[PDB]
């Protein structure tokens, strides 16, 4: 093929132009996102049952839904939990690769069949099924500066006006409003209700009637009467829309004839759907929009469109109402993409500079500058063809593959230059001769690298997807680099290169003397090959030591500009106390860290382990990285200082932390353990078993560390139990008692009303001051059969009991999630095995199971070594094919430990871990060192065969000829990766992980291979000779 | 194009003054003028609907509203004229 | 939405469904209308080559999120999602 | 027909249309299937 | 060659329009739309 | 339990999945229980 | 119709570029394709 295109340069140029056009168009049409879909598809079902506790929710909603989730394909596990706020959540996690739309529709269909079984209140509220594995592109918080209208008004405004333009903006795949529109709130008064001998049942019944729709029919409608001339539609609308109209509802007419309107026994006003959550932005009322990016949309363009729309709507906002952006992932993505592009451009420039330093002519240096961009553009085209995007993983895959591309271009061009200079051939004949020395090697190397990288793409789970991104990117880049090296670069060398003191003279003399000394050293080494095999064994042993002692990880934590911090007050703490704690947190953040922190979005009544009035959250947003110099101003330092401060708060368990590297996934550290109840032992027995297990793990501090629950402990509850005998003796219906209690103390959703062209809920609930203490039960009366009012104290008894504020299930059985991680220096596998062993000593009828990260760890551990064995076998077969011998390949497979030693040394000295970037860097280092060894061995063998040279003479000539391109490639790649190693700014964790391992591996491989590969070749040839 | 609409307003205060339920008013008006689908029946082995509606001649002119009586709480019939009024307004029969 | 008019239908049904039915893959435009009989129709035209079955699945998913925001009468009646065409293939008249 | 038209007037107009098709265009037109109260621009008694 | 997922989706979509007309006892008991046949893959007996 | 096969599913994979699910249940069976398999059509496929 | 009119010019541009590239590849020259690509306006004028 190279000889075909040496005589047809125009056809090579045409192919290069086609590749360039495809790559440019694909770059113009590729999605941009921070990360791709990593976590498995998870569909979440949310059902709200207002006023209920955890047991009520679990028994009436979650259990009924969990019993009807049959016939859903590719379901891994199912979990649920119903908390004391009345919310039931059921999450269905599906196998990776499952279609999210099909999974969601299947779940929705099953739930639609299983909805008629739920309580009427749950059905009336509505059950929401939605994808839970997605992440918010940005959060747009809307605040009030003047301080006129509270958060309910802001939420109503955003719902009414700001949701439609944001939703119809291009690329916005979903908009979630943090809050809710208005609702006609009716605040009953027990004293007034008893005054007129009324009940919340009467208010519910008199509110249900009004505000109904009548199919009034049609005036003159068919079948008409012969001779009808006018046909009109009748509009009968007895609707209520104002608070005054609602206050005019008639509930009773006393004996004297006076009318008792609703306003006489209630305070009616516009309020919010729910008051559970109070969100503030630097101390001011706020609402927000959770904007999610669409499928195949460009993140940067979508963010720009949203900002442009919001700026367009700015002039029309009320007095002193502005837009703030507490969370936004676009600046980080933009910085990362720019840094990667800068790295690629710098790598190309460095390749040019090194080529001119060594070859010393512009015609040669221009060839790699033309070849590498063609490969990059073709790689972008291939990514587009495969449905990939432009994200962090693919971008770092390109950055890692920029070594193979420059290596190929440099190898071809340097070989042609050497042939021209040594044999004095013209460019065309020199190129023809040179391509005959490496054309087979290039194909063999393509196969070897394919074998090295493709098996990495067959992992399963989150790690499988992360590895697949890198594998596809690097394999596509390498395949295009090899195809270009056989098509374009030979033509450019044939047509462009022209026939062949000072600083360059000094450098040439220095390099000639250096090569002479190197060949003398190699010759001296080959006389005592036995001595240096012991050194190889020592190096391999050191590699094994460093590898076993290297801590493992998943991804490096990064400074994304924001971090979280959540409070957790004792059991029974109310909303005011949590608000005080959150205000203290906000004051600390905005006073001590005023030069690092830009805003604190304190969400009260919210949490991650469990919602409630005694929990809160604060999304602290930091200033731009350019305004936070030094390591003391990064997120880690700020978090450590805050933790130092927050340990003194003797009112709540406040602690701050950084966001995960992939927010879509969780912490991804430690293990996730579930303690299921497989014998119907109840909640008390299950909790006792969990406590016993905690007692057991406390005796192994050297293996298990930080083992804690992921749920809320039992808390006191007010138990009011009606007396059937007394209720019947006084003629009070149990239905009336239950309705009165529920409507007064938990609230009832009666019907809807139409305000400003929107259907809004109507709620009835007691006034705050009448439902606050146990002594307020006696203020509420229920009408008896004969028309007398009977208090709750005449037929009821009250006591304080214990119960869980948040119950849990796993796969349909009661569960207790337990979290923790392995002790330092111990693999998570040992901690998992120890937890399994300790969970086997627990009482009968109690099981366990692993969820999430532990599930994925089991799946991947089942796969780890087989892929490595297959890769090794395929590589050996390819090398035996290339070299026409079963023994020569061992001279090429023994160079794998050489670069790994350097990678491990760099990671250990720099204090990094064995994260994904580390494995990908190791693979690329192994591939490039193997490429160098393949070329050396092939040149030596060809010299020893075609020209009939000796073993030692052939080896020495091969190493002498191959020294220069090895050094050029090593220098170019090391210089091009150095900025990643030195980078410490925005998103520098991934950069350092990618760069330090690669730099160390290249240094060690370059230093060691040039001296060991001849040793391996000579020893192998001597051993297997006849 | 825009079409005339016969808007009929129910004075609820007068409705309870005469002891007539709002639910009864709504049901009577809907069943009389718009027709009400009550339940099904079997016709030659096929399930078909049952409809109730006023006879044509009693639901044509605007003054036919007052020919329809709704029973009060005490059992005394009350015409729609006693607790309602009607007016003609324009409107769009189909918005896009 | 039985018994409603065009304005009420547009405000309380069509506008609510249109908000969520937005951002679906390969959506090209959508036109909705509501007539005096209380019926709201929303038609979503997708890019040529779009899979109509997957498009219907996504439309169903988005709509189900918008259902709990509609009037209870609309829920009781039900909302039908099905692929749409404008022109008849044929008409089979039957006489005596 | 104008807003507020009834079934009889629309049927009269459709009868005029059918008579024209079957009288003036009797050489080219073979059948007319007039559907009253139905249309592609919304339903009503004024449409056919 | 029909896709069972889409077939079930369409069948259930058409069922959702007929469900309101069914009695209350049927809905309370629960309607199941499974994609299976009249034959058994296997039987798992359990004895004490 | 009379287990039927979802349309488009593999009989042998489904049978293996069911037999692996039951292995997670045997430890918690009350004393005397025992799973007996009186009918199965997948072993014929496997052995054939 | 609007979409067709909008995307017509790009179709002609890409078609002409692809034909030029194919001719240059086949004929191993940048000048013979130019000699062959100057005849297109002589056919388009006839079509118009
Ligand atoms: C110019 C353009 C070029 C573009 C080229 C792009 C090519 C990229 C293609 C990559 C496509 C992959 C997507 C799949 C995704 C779904 C994988 C499912 C997970 C389960 C697999 C586990 C497994 O199937 O993995 C083992 C399977 O084999 C292998 O990987 C095969 C190795 C391939 C070697 C390639 C060499 C090519 C060069 C030859 C000249 C089996 O072992 P297991 O992992 O299943 O388990 C082992 C335990 O014993 C039991 O658990």
Numbering used by the authors:
A (entry chain B): 1 to 500, 509 to 1034
B (entry chain C): 721 to 816
C (entry chain C): 49 to 144
D (entry chain C): 577 to 624
E (entry chain A): 97 to 144
F (entry chain A): 289 to 336
G (entry chain C): 865 to 912
Quoted from the paper:
The tripartite AcrAB-TolC efflux pump is the dominant constitutive system by which Enterobacterales like Escherichia coli and Klebsiella pneumoniae extrude antibiotics. AcrAB-TolC is composed of (i) an inner membrane trimeric H+/drug antiporter (i.e., AcrB), (ii) a hexameric periplasmic adapter protein (i.e., AcrA), that interacts with AcrB and connects to (iii) TolC, a trimeric outer membrane channel. AcrB sequesters and transports drug substrates via a concerted conformational cycling of each of its protomers, which adopt the Loose (L), Tight (T) or Open (O) state. K. pneumoniae and E. coli encode several RND-pumps, but in both species AcrAB-TolC is the major constitutive tripartite efflux pump system and their AcrB proteins share 92% identical residues.
